[PDB]
Design a binder for this molecule. Structure first.
Ligand SMILES: Nc1ccn([C@@H]2O[C@H](CO)[C@@H](O)[C@H](F)[C@H]2O)c(=O)n1
Ligand SMILES: Nc1ccn([C@@H]2O[C@H](CO)[C@@H](O)[C@H](F)[C@H]2O)c(=O)n1
Lengths: 809, 809
């Protein structure tokens, strides 16, 4: 049908059809008369999976022969989404499977909707790991993703009476055709016990053992025949476990609980024992696998053959675990082991919010990991001796830099442990990396300036353009060819088409088609009516106070109040869509969701408004939903308080897909505006410097309430029960927070935000100039490919060269 | 190699080789350079499984078209053992796979040893269900086995310091290639709640829901292209289950515990709530499936299309569950529903031991299954009204026949419920069925004589001759052809070879080969030395007081003491082998195991004994071990106290495989002796009548101790610490039981047992006459095929005709 989806050759289509029929019969044990759409999905998945295996076996054989330096990406989250279409895209199989299924009388897009998301992450950090795996394979790096195979991923969100309800995400119910269990490579992990000192060093004894069983999932590169591995560990009890009889068997559940469920917190730290066990479990099993693979090639060459990347501090225990193994088991002296560790490890920071930083109580580590606590104390003493020598007499610096925090309860600061034991530390956008050196890690930057780097985030143009927006990928390829898909900088060539009347019409046509498709999806799956001629105003991301969904709410109510004031005046019609999950225990975030649905209940049913304004809460936001709504958006809301969102990646997805951005100068928004030109972005609000000035003076929300009549009206509406007639005081917590306890200064940006939104509406009235600005955004989005990001990690941190060359098919 | 293993045609072998290579690559994702023996086992299993699928799909399609009467065999146990060889045998694939694997450079017998037993049963009752499934498929019946998919089957037994230790049987660790998950046919099961009475009948409300997910395993008939289904249910929590957040997800384990583990009791009742949940879970899910299938063809014709066979009282809740569905949900009147139920259900009793009978506390049923208790009360009232009308004024009969037992705690007698609600009740051997009508169910037999039947047990000659003893199957086929394999009565033709010198030599040759193979197995896997020229004296079965492993122990010690008395006298050398598992909480059974190993420790290390006597405890007795030791045995010990072993089936296995039997006139031993002729059996001891006479008089063990000096010596050796030097009083519990509290009258049979054993030893000295008696046993073992047993159930209980005709291939 379309060119970028590859060839549908007669031989290929014939072969796909027969293998589809073979799997339906032999694998699924069904005939065509009993088969359901789900059976058909599985037959296709097995057919496509077969095409991966030869490339998978020979990629791994190739790494064994050539023995390149190996990259290990450690993460507690891999937010993968669906796998079927992605695999077809990377293998150039999409048109062939489309033809083959068509000839069997099936609709492939309908089959694609049957696959469950692999929802093994919360949001941006988990999705970054997924984009990174795709880019590493595409760039020919010998890379392995290592994590946990959660039985339950991020919960499914239902909305009941306007409130969020959580349901278990039982994603494995029907099986997972993409994974291969590898029970033969099962490894022991130790917990509890005590430390014994012998003549020949320390010994960790009397431990409880949990087994780690690996499951391998293939990661295909884009049309290069490379297939890398993501290996996820599952917890298993040993067979003599607890071994009255019946209870001992049932108590096996206690050990296997380690891999049962993903902790559903985005940007927040909960110091629970089970979470600590998860963090050690992934680290201990992964490191044995790394060392095994290294010996099957003297530890001086260890950092020449191994790089370990820590995704946040979640796998920070890799540092003392590597020391434990080298010192206690391999009998290296401390100094040599430390040199190896530092040269092997590198650490990526993803946030500056204090509540997100991991600070583990010493009493937890004492009981659970007694040998690791000893090692951490020794690391701290030697590190602080270095600080003392560099800054003699500076006693407060010593207190500030310690890995051990004093107080009511002693804690270990895991971020300080990561900086001490890594040769590289990076932030995830230029402004964030600068904030790290200037504020929270200033003392560390002064001691070791060479460690600190920036690696601005990116997204994969395979999933986030070709897969989710084939119409746009196609009109682009018609003009500049297909090479941009793995060299996104080539989109710059599109600037010579900004005055091309044919291109302008095509770009605008693709957007309208995307909007019609999404408008139809909403009616089908959720029985809701929207106007596809309206501006699609979209804010999708996890619900948090710092992300300021509440500022969006205030704008929505302002628009409603202005309409009610002058009903017969023309306004640019809008569909305002907001979606995202709240952490189950985050009360304020749950109240914000209720507020959004409550506003919808009033606005969507007001006869005077008509179809000029609609407010929709998008339920169960997740990767597969993002792939639907992002190509349909006109306006992308990126409105965090300046200095709070480290990078953002959702922002980049919208830019690539033909939406304009309204945003603060925060995270990667700054670099996006710089690439496109500030004239082509809708920037508003305080800069970081303005926020600092306000904090120094003291933020008084009452001032704004007093001086802005439109803002006062909204607060009075909220307080009095306008949006909750039966429960007049429902939103009192929200009002109280806004008026007296707002860490994120919602009111301070309100005036400039509303004025900026007026400018957006003005441009949308002129379709031709709107679209020309869109082309200028798409054309300059090249920097934000994760291929660029990974190439920088490879060259500047891991010490390896990327390769775009094919392996033989 | 050998004829009964089928053809190894060039086309077939070529095809098997390529499909083996395909599975190794595509299914296992391995190359020949990394593959282990386990990988090779799985590639073969997948290759053989492929040959089942076409026959499986068309067998089930055939039943849908023809709509025969369907047979549902309900059991909490299916003791299946390994599946690979059995599948090859039934499909005529054994020689072809042997050739194909040979040409790939592999040894198929070595691959076969990698498969785990499916150990989903305890002993005789579970293994009977497995033999029955094989015969039903071989006889072309539309039959389904329904049970529970336990995550952990019967424990693995380790012996440490002579004591039994239990380990979890994690049989699913590496996956099960034989099953097909069917999550699309998942069904809800209800627990707890309360009963509400409305205008339109009772309603069961406020229940907790557990999901039942089916897994289907194919059951191939012998060379007839029929493949039936065994469907096993697995427990799953619903997704809104318990739905702070983390705990609710972890608490899903509570529901899923239902299918976690097999209760390890043989012939003993434990009134635990979890066991009751297991029993209801299998019944509720199975009955919905039955009704579903019946509607997809008015309940008057229900018993014409459905037969339900209850394997013991474990699934007895089928009776009130069927009433519940017909009355509460389908709105049939009571009387009509009861008629349907009675005509549909039939019940098999497997024991007369009082401690094995299921008597559930009313307070348990009240809380767990409140509607079922009400239904049971109503059944009882109507049944007792019938008893009152038939035997007016007989008030004690009313108390004795009630389904409700009075006392400290009220209980429901599940055996009484089964008789009341079934049109047929059978025992499992002629003597057992007679005991049922004369003693424990006498009152019921007087009320409804027509209900009571006998169906003597049998074993499948596929697993228990062709599979485990190909050498014997072959020498038999050389003379009478292959038709006996599914018509075992043809073995009678072998009586014309009892004087054939060629046959005599061949029968004896096969036994010696079997003994050498087993003697070698013992050294390899267990580092133990045995003399293959000795008489192999074998007692393998679960450890229980009624089975009298202790009487065997007494004989062993008698032989040892006689040798020590006259060392230079000739005795026929013996290897005495005893094996079997004890229930984890059965203290006396655990003490008996310790006694056996303790005797071995003394006897096997006495230089004066030499290799004239050896005592071996066979560890981890299970189906796969039975297939090894039974073909190797010379003497089969079947020595239960008369009237205690309902049938036995181990006895039949030994008879078919060329061992002679020493046994009491108990269970099926009586019919075996009758078939072969009493001159060809070694019968000893009290009959049932003698046991009754002794009970009436009062059993005094002291009398025997006083009058038998050899017996006194043994007791004194046990008491004084001869067999436990460091712990002199170790066996005091055993001695105390023998002397004062022996329900099974060990001493009463001791003299006759020892004398009978002398006669065995006498015959073994004359190899030619031993072997001639063996031929007379094998020749008359035909009655004990489960094909005969199933044909009798079909004709006399289920009302269906067996068919030996092939389905098209
Ligand atoms: N526990 C956390 C901490 C930070 N993050 C996010 O990580 C993304 C990837 O770097 C960034 O784009 C975002 F700026 C950041 O908020 C997250 O999703 N979970
Ligand atoms: N809970 C029970 C009760 C009885 N049985 C056995 O069942 C076998 C099959 O009928 C018989 O051959 C045996 F005689 C009997 O002991 C058993 O294994 N478990």
């Amino acid at each position: 049908q379309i060119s970028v989806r590859g060839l549908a050759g007669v031989e290929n289509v014939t072969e796909l059809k027969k293998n589809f029929n073979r799997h339906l019969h032999f694998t699924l044990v069904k005939d065509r008369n009993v088969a359901t759409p789900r059976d058909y999905y599985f037959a296709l998945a097995h057919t496509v999976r077969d095409h991966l295996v030869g490339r998978w076996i020979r990629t791994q054989q190739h790494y064994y022969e050539k023995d390149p330096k190996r990259i290990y990406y450690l993460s507690l989250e891999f937010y993968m989404g669906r796998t079927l279409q992605n695999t077809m895209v990377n293998l150039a199989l999409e048109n062939a499977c489309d033809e083959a299924t068509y000839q069997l009388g099936l609709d492939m897009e309908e089959l694609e909707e049957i696959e469950e998301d692999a929802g093994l992450g919360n949001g941006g950090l988990g999705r970054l790991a997924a984009c990174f795996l795709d880019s590493m394979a595409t760039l020919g790096l010998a890379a392995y993703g290592y994590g946990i195979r959660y039985e339950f991923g991020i919960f499914n969100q239902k909305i009941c009476g306007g409130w969020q309800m959580e349901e278990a995400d039982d994603w494995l119910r029907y099986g997972n055709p993409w994974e291969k269990a590898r029970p033969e490579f099962t490894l022991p992990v130790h917990f509890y016990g005590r430390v014994e000192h012998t003549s020949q060093g320390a010994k960790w004894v009397d431990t409880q053992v949990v087994l780690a069983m690996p499951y391998d999932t293939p990661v295909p590169g884009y049309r290069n025949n490379v297939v890398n591995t993501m290996r996820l560990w599952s917890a298993k009890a040993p067979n003599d476990f607890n071994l009255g009889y019946i209870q001992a068997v049932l108590d096996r559940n206690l050990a296997e609980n380690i891999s049962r469920v993903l902790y559903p917190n985005d940007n927040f730290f909960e110091g629970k024992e089970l979470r600590l066990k998860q963090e050690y479990f992934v680290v201990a099993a992964t490191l044995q696998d790394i060392i095994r693979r290294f010996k099957s090639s003297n530890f001086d060459a260890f950092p020449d053959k191994v790089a370990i990347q820590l995704n946040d501090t979640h796998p920070s225990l890799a540092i003392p675990e590597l020391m434990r193994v080298l010192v206690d088991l391999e009998r290296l002296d401390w100094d040599k082991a430390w040199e190896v560790t530092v040269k092997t490890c590198a650490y990526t920071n993803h946030t500056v919010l204090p509540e997100a930083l991991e600070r583990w109580p010493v009493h937890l580590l004492e009981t659970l990991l007694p040998r690791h606590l000893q090692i951490i104390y020794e690391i701290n003493q030697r590190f602080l001796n270095r600080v003392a020598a560099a800054f003699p007499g500076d006693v407060d610096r010593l207190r500030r830099m310690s890995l051990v925090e004093e107080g009511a309860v002693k804690r270990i600061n895991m971020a300080h442990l990561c900086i001490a034991g890594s040769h590289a530390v990076n932030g995830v956008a230029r402004i964030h990396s600068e904030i790290l050196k200037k504020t929270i890690f200033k003392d560390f930057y002064e001691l070791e300036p060479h460690k600190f780097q920036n690696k601005t985030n990116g997204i994969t143009p395979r999933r986030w353009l070709v897969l989710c927006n084939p119409g746009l990928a196609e009109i682009i390829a018609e003009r500049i060819g297909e090479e941009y898909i793995s060299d996104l900088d080539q989109l710059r060539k599109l600037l010579s088409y900004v005055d091309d009347e044919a291109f302008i019409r095509d770009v605008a046509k693709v957007k309208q088609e995307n909007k019609l498709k999404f408008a139809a999806y909403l009616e089908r799956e959720y029985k809701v009516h929207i106007n596809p001629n309206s501006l699609f105003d979209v804010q999708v991301k996890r619900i948090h106070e710092y992300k300021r969904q509440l500022l969006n709410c205030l704008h929505v109510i302002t628009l409603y109040n202005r309409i009610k004031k002058e009903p017969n005046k023309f306004v640019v019609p809008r569909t305002v869509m907001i979606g995202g999950k709240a952490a189950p225990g985050y009360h304020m975030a749950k109240m914000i969701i209720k507020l959004i649905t409550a506003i919808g209940d009033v606005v969507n049913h007001d006869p005077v408004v008509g179809d000029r304004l609609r407010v929709i809460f998008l339920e169960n936001y997740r990767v597969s939903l993002a792939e639907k709504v992002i190509p349909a958006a006109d306006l992308s809301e990126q409105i965090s308080t300046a200095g709070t969102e480290a990078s953002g990646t959702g922002n980049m997805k919208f830019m690539l897909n033909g939406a304009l951005t309204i945003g603060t100068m925060d995270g990667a928004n700054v670099e996006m505006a710089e690439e496109a030109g500030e004239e082509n972005f809708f920037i508003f609000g305080m800069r970081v410097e303005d926020v600092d000035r306000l904090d120094q003076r003291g933020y008084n929300a009452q001032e704004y309430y007093d001086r802005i009549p439109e803002l006062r009206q909204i607060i009075e509406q909220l307080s009095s029960g306008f949006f909750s007639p039966k429960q007049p005081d429902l939103f009192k917590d929200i009002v109280n927070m806004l008026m007296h306890h707002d860490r994120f200064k919602v009111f301070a940006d309100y005036e400039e935000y509303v004025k900026c939104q007026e400018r957006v509406s003005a441009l949308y009235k002129n379709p031709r100039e709107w679209t020309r600005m869109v082309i200028r955004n798409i054309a300059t989005s090249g920097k934000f490919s994760s291929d660029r990001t990974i190439a920088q990690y490879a060259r500047e941190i891991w010490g390896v060269e990327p390769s775009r060359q094919r392996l033989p098919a």
